[PDB]
């Protein structure tokens, strides 16, 4: 299974803990991601950034490892949104 819009993941950016997020559809006129990269929408903070699969972990199967709370800003809000309303627009 290649990643598709709507997929729920944890995403890793340098600097941050693995982060509740989802794969987004590309906006009509928006910048296209680099090769083998996706628009990742980060729950809680609502930022979007491009990432490849090496930093993308499926959410169901990785929650035990990554979905414990922490005081990084927006993180716990991000946990709430992925569990409760992951396909909302925010």
Q: What is the CATH number of the domain that holds 37?
A: 2.30.30.140
Residue 70 is assigned to a structural domain of this protein: yes
DSSP state of 68: S
Residue 71 is assigned to a structural domain of this protein: yes
Q: Which approach determined this entry?
A: X-ray
Dig out the tokens for 78 from the structure: 């991000």
Helix (H), strand (E) at residue 11 = strand 8-11
How far is CA 63 from each of CA 40, 50, 58, 84, rounded to the nearest angstrom? Answer: 17, 21, 8, 14
Residue 79 is assigned to a structural domain of this protein: yes
Residue 3 is assigned to a structural domain of this protein: no
Q: Which domain holds residue 13?
A: 8-84
The domain tally of the chain equals: 1
Alpha helix positions (H), the chain:
59-66, 75-84
Residue 89 is assigned to a structural domain of this protein: no
30 Cα distance to chain centroid: 18
Which residue bears the tokens 């729950």? Answer: 43
Longest CA pairwise span in the chain (Å): 37
Residue 1 is assigned to a structural domain of this protein: no
Angle at 29 between CA 24 and CA 35, to 5 degrees: 60
């Amino acid at each position: 299974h290649a990643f598709k819009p709507g997929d729920l993941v944890f995403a890793k950016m340098k600097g941050y803990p693995h982060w509740p997020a989802r794969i987004d559809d590309i906006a009509d006129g928006a910048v296209k991601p680099p090769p083998n990269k996706y628009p990742i929408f980060f729950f809680g903070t609502h930022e979007t950034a491009f990432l490849g699969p090496k930093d993308l972990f499926p959410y169901d199967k990785s929650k035990d490892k990554y979905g414990k709370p922490n005081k990084r800003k927006g993180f716990n809000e991000g946990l709430w949104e992925i569990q409760n309303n992951p396909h909302a627009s925010y």
